[model samples]
Target: VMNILFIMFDQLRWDYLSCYGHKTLNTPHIDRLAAKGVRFDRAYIQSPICGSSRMSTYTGRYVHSHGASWNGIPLKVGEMTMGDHLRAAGMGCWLVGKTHMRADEEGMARLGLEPDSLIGARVAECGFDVFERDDGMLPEGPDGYYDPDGAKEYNKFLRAKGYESDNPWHDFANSGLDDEGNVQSGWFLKNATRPANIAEEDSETPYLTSRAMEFIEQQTGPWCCHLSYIKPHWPYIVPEPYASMFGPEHVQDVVRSDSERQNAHPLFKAFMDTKVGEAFSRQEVRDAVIPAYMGLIKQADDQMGRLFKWLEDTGRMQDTMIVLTSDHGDFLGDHWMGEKTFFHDASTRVPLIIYDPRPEADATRGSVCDALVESIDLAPTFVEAAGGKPAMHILEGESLIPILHGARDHTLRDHVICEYDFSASPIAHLNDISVRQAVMFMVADKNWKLIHFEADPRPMLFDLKNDPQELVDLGGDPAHADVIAGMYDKLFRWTRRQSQRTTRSEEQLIAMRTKSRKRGIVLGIYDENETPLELTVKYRDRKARPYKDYLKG
Candidate 1:
């Protein structure tokens, strides 16, 4: 039996690894994992945000099929899971760190279960026998990493070490001290070689690492642990050696490509605007952009070193089938976006390296699989590796087992889809009223690229042979209709294939609603004719609050 140890980092970009030819950013540990494993270069995520991506992760289905079409929707109860199968086969499944699956009360009830919030780190009910859910690192408070107290502590630690900056914590900080002599949060400072008043142990990176190492040692027997860290995610707070690793001159701000900042698709456009809070200005393209971003990446890399060393010294490095992946990628100044959630490679792509120590008879080790793989496929792959047959009923993904064997160059079908919603429902929680859709389609031989947008109907076609940057949209151009038509058909067929996995039916949904009402939960149903009817008894809930506060029973 092959034991598994899966590791996932949140918001890691696809091209961040030194093994992938990054000139500046050093990710020796992750690079090492890639060197010893198979790196999926074209791995795609189903959704850009946390919640929807994770739903696809757990169910092996697309966001729409799993009923988590947006951020507020959690994994439906009727859905079969990798954990459900793995545990049935006697494997010890564990989940740690960030598990961002929304547990919408109404959605949960629709799935015939009690309502629970699954957002943030609270989405652990799927399978883990012993889980430390809802335990990932975050900025200390609403003030974030650049809080006045955090800065004060940092300054004190530096002063004790006889280290001084002519202007301490000024450059790269989000802002100087606010009105109350308090520094605003998210003030992006990089170097921190100097000791602050804060103790080394209490620092963010050290604290998380200590707990992860402890868990790795204690957990036994085919365990699956996720160590989600907070570094390189946001606030860019560096504590000493890592903080001062690169100077302001060496650190480059992320650059926004021309097509990305201006004429990109809505999925890419909306995501960029969300990051910087507005459109990208010309001033954003100057020097020091890459260095600043690289500095943050290097910080995460160093922390990974500690974990990798522990694995090596304990002799678990060679035996465990380690998987490294991310929820999504970061814009990191690409297309003028500061963070992720877009259709561009910078936002949609993730570095997925899977190391299966016990490869099957035909499995290929240390290979680079350039086939486009979706994050949704990870669950089935994981389940198969746990000595169980991959559940075939609900998955929209094909097994990576073929890609692992190097028998298939592109195991994915013609097109892989990704979606995002701007409807800021208490459910979706986005700032805009824009929903974006993306579809990437091409032949198995990788000749052409076709991309379609939902917000803006005009599609984009790129001849990947000549233009890999994907700056031009050839949909309007008449000469390439043959190629365009073929890609359109593939994209359509993939969509049709994915839609076959739907679980909620109108009749079944109505029956479940009736049961919930009988148990004292009120529900409102909208008919096909757009008529709204109350499911609650009017006098029954005179004193008891209605489930949806906005609707009167």
Candidate 2:
């Protein structure tokens, strides 16, 4: 059985890394991992936001099924998580970094589940045994702490290392010191050009990396440690070497075209007009921020190098299955959007690389797969790799074991789905609609991508075969109306029976047919002779001529 190391990077773009096709910025470590494993060219997330997407990834279900649509929304009670599945199969699942999980406190209280109880703890931690959980956002303002639970232990470590402050996480680790000894917080756009004052080892990425190493050294048996990193996401700044590595020259051409902005879909127009999007659209802002974003990615890559080295040195490389991915991608001004709140490939698509240490994966090693994979698939893959089969009724994702073993040339899914709930966004508020109605869904096959909005009757369609850049809108074109209709049918069929039931299997339901009615209760019979003679005596009047007499009457 292989030990699983499921690593997730926050807001890392699919194309930013060297392995994914960056020309200048090098991510040698991640590229090397790609060389050792199968790199998926077209993987997408269930949702674009952090919380909803991570929830889907953890549960192996879609955001609509799990119902955690945004950040701070608790996952509903009774949801079976990766821990629930893997632990049942005798593999221990532990968390080294962040899950971004908000527990269902009200549900727990209703069931009288004490926080110290086994079930309660598992529910609170999203089914993983906690090593250390830092959502990695430690922003502080004049009012109070932005995230009270964020960076609790990390701050203590910073204090011990002589960085003095009530919140050194923000002041030192994320900020740079000016010549006048003033703190230059990375949260400001101008400070993005400055390197953080803290040492690289004391930063978020390295801290999490070291903790993961410590946990791996202590583990004994088959285990899956979620070594989730919080950097390369936001407050984009890096320390020392990585900070000076890249500059404005490294930033690539923006994916947006003027034509895209001129006749954008109403939904897309709303996103493009947001403040963040507008800021990123400016050349000056991109020059300042993109370099920092590159530096952050570089730091993450270096940490991976450190981690890979330790894994090899400790001799755990042969027994571990390493899977690397991101929760979502950053827009970086793509489609005139800064944040990942839309269904554009820049926001929805992400990098996926799986390095299976088993000999069964040898043939597919260093090969790139163009199959459509989703973040939800990770849990089932972990379940299968941990020497157990994933129950399809509970887990919506299919295992990659077939592809890993070279038994299948492609994934079972033909189209990939991505969704966004913009109820809380400015677009919903400006449009004078309830947040509930501000929803959008996307379904894309190999050739066509269609977006359906709850508020609008018109759907946005893109012909990937022709307009690969998605620069042109075919939704309004009469020539492509049939294509749009076909895409709608796919969406309709996909949602027909989604998340129906999981408690009973189809075989169990089939076996239950007429079995419950067989109990000797006085139930009505379909036919006169269907009931047993002893049970039907009173109804038949104990006479053979009763049926003929009744019929004649």
Candidate 3:
């Protein structure tokens, strides 16, 4: 049986890997996988933030259709996920790491769902059974930890292994030590350059890889194993020698220009004025953070080397399909922004590489494709590889199997989209943009990108042919009104898709043509002979008993 090993890394930039044209960073292990697979050069995520982006990937729907717009927002229970679709196809789906998924407990309760029930448990877990689950965020706040339950589990693991800290996840894995022996948290950008106080093998990246290896060894049937990693993200300190692997020289030059701030859009300027953006705007901050960022990515790549070698040793490489990508890209001071909440490629585009083991895919092996792929397309591709068609009515994405098998080199669709809903965000509150009007959308033809903001009357447009870096904004320019018009037209058609009709497939719907009439629902029969005999056979010449004879009264 064939299996799918779906891997996702958090906040990993698309261009940092050696396979994606990064000049200095030598991510040869990841590059090795790309050399054996099809590397998609123009893949974009449905949304830029973590929870919503991962939701789009898992559900195969756009953020607006799924309605889980940001972090901590619950995915509605009615939304059918990748796991639901695959299990219906007789393929097991299991998760081994971070999903960034918040369960729709309220929705489940309203529907009278019991968490103890098998179906209810799957719903509570975002349609995946928990196989050593961990979201890997252990920030100790004034109230408590962000992930309280997960924090205890990992910290307990560390303490059992003699790490000797109340919160080793924060103190050892995510922090460094000062010269005087005080614990310096990796949350601060300056401490990022310092080495973490944990062992190399025991850190988050290696530990997750080990867990995935164990999962592969234990599974008896074909499965879709979600091997997610919480690395190369924030709390950017890495264990030595990975921590000391790179320096400021390895960092790419900042991609922003001072001219960007001259006459920016209201939303664009609002993000640049935020705390993170301002902090990263300094030269020292980028110097300190990018080196640590590079080190963490190197560590993740090395772990992939270990996992891939083990798969080959166990002969699973001949049967498994490997897909490696990121939830979303990070914007380390790029475009004068910090987190991944914008339409820039640095924040929205992700690295997508797929290696299919079957011999039919050999024609396109190691080929580079320039299709306009979206993050939502992964679920469809996985189902097709498992010998099942995508649930077309529920899943909004198309499978990439044809491209993998050399059936076609480009996607059928010419445009791709990404969205951002900043309602309840500090940016929205500070900018006085109402919650109802804080939504934004991006539609790109891989040449021209147009951004539509609900609150703003004007559009933000970028010409990739002239400004690949996306430094120049040509929104209010009168010369290119026609290009913006075309992009918005694409967005309009995309929004009108049948996204909410999930109860049946497109096949089922099209097959319903005149089905009612065939099933004895002859509506306009003036006489029995006016309609076909098949439609009115019971009414026309039935040997039926009288209704009064059967009545008991």
Candidate 4:
């Protein structure tokens, strides 16, 4: 069996990698991987958030089909997980890090979808022989990092730690020059293992490198391991060596232009408040975005280098299938947005490098795969490679194996879709959730993009051929009617087809009931029409009103 080592990161951007034609960032290891394999230039995440994107990855189902489009939804049992199929193939699958599938014990019991154990994630139990370092257990972190002032204060703490750059405020720490060009720090882990401490000279890139190399050496061939690193995510904390590598003043600016922002639709306007709601200037995005983003990119590059070097030195490079990917991408100050959770390319498009070992028969090496693809495709492709049969059910993602082989000129999919419902909340509902003011879904193909919002009548459409940053809205313009019409049909067909599908599994029905009853939520329950119907509004708030008032509405 061909050894598969898939390395994934959170909030990583494709533009930051040097191999992707970027000048500032340095991803030598990933670059080498790209040199030997196929690099997907237009790879996109299924969604912009962690839970939703990851669900798409393991289930081989779209976010809508799996009903885990938002963070609140739990992965139901008998839902056909990646681990379930992999185990059937008799392959020793291991999930060594971060699977953010949260399970509410009470919610699980209510919905009747409760598992034998209602712990957040049962990755090991699902099928993996070993599931190590899951969500709450992996690394400890303080909650509430999403608040604007909260984010500002945390960044200041890093600044006090020694990253004191002021160009665009990308670093609260390091400033000034060094003799070497070792750009590999900001957003790197401060420590590798338990009680791991970071020095002023410590880089997360090297530490992740150390851990990954150690693991690879111990594993014999025919193993599939995912070394999921959690850096280059936020606080941009890299050690001194990489800290001084890139002069923040020189990083390129990829923010939206003034004309582009002026033409933005109401859907885009909803997300504009995240940076500066009522008063956001395009120049503001242009000023601080370049340096801060480049700082993160540099750290990512250094991390990639460490992983690539290990693969080459072990003599396993010839026999292994290597893939470097990210769960989602960072917004990086685009459209006056500080971070992710938008439909724009900066938030959706991620770096994808696939190094297939059998090269003479596969001429796809060293070339960019532009065919549309999403994170969901990874699991299915791995299963096929492991010599397992495909699931009897239809998978939203098609196999990338054909593209891996010498099947040239094949289009994987016509469009890539991403969605979010960040505003629907019960706790801190108005402050924490309402302030984010947006419910979004986006679909993108080769050049055209369409964005749908719950509050808008018309979708925001963009022709990427003219605007790459995706700031300009072409939906209202009559000149792009054909493009808009085409995307409309595609989106309509895709979603409608999913809505029409019937749920058959008795386990699915049982799981739904258990999940509904456990959470005190009515969403998981279904009616006789096979449509999701509401049984009673009073079910959520039993003591709120008189029976007469409840009947009046």
- Highest-scoring model, lDDT: 3
Tens digits of per-residue lDDT for model 4, 137-176? 1112376223222223323434666654431122223222
Model 2: CA > 4 A from native? 517-553
Q: lDDT for model 2, please.
A: 0.87
Residues 1-553 of candidate 2: C-alpha lDDT, one tens digit per residue: 5799999999988998899999988999999999999999989999999999999999999987888888778998889899999998999999988889999999999989877988899899899999888899787679987679899989888898888887788888888889999999888877888889998889999998999999998988889999998878888888988888888888999888999999898878888888898998988888888899899888898889999998899888998999999999888887888978888788788999999999999999999988888889998988888888798887888898899889986899878888888777666777776786789899998799999988888888888888877888888999988889888888888787548598997788889886754455566678668877766555565446657787875
Ranking by TM-score: 3, 2, 4, 1
Quote each prediction's TM-score. 0.72, 0.94, 0.96, 0.73
Misplaced by over 4 Å in model 3 are 523-530, 537-553
Ranking of models by lDDT: 3, 2, 4, 1
lDDT of each: 0.59, 0.87, 0.90, 0.61
RMSD of 4: 13.2
> Over the full model, what C-alpha lDDT does candidate 4 score relative to the true structure?
0.61
Candidate 3 per-residue lDDT over residues 161-223, each given as its tens digit: 999877889899999998898999999999998999888888899988988998889988889
Q: Number of the top candidate by TM-score? A: 3
Relative to the true structure, candidate 1 reaches a TM of 0.72
Clashing pairs in 2: none
* TM-score-best of 3 and 4: 3
The candidate with the higher lDDT, 1 or 2, is: 2
Q: How does candidate 2 fare on TM-score?
A: 0.94
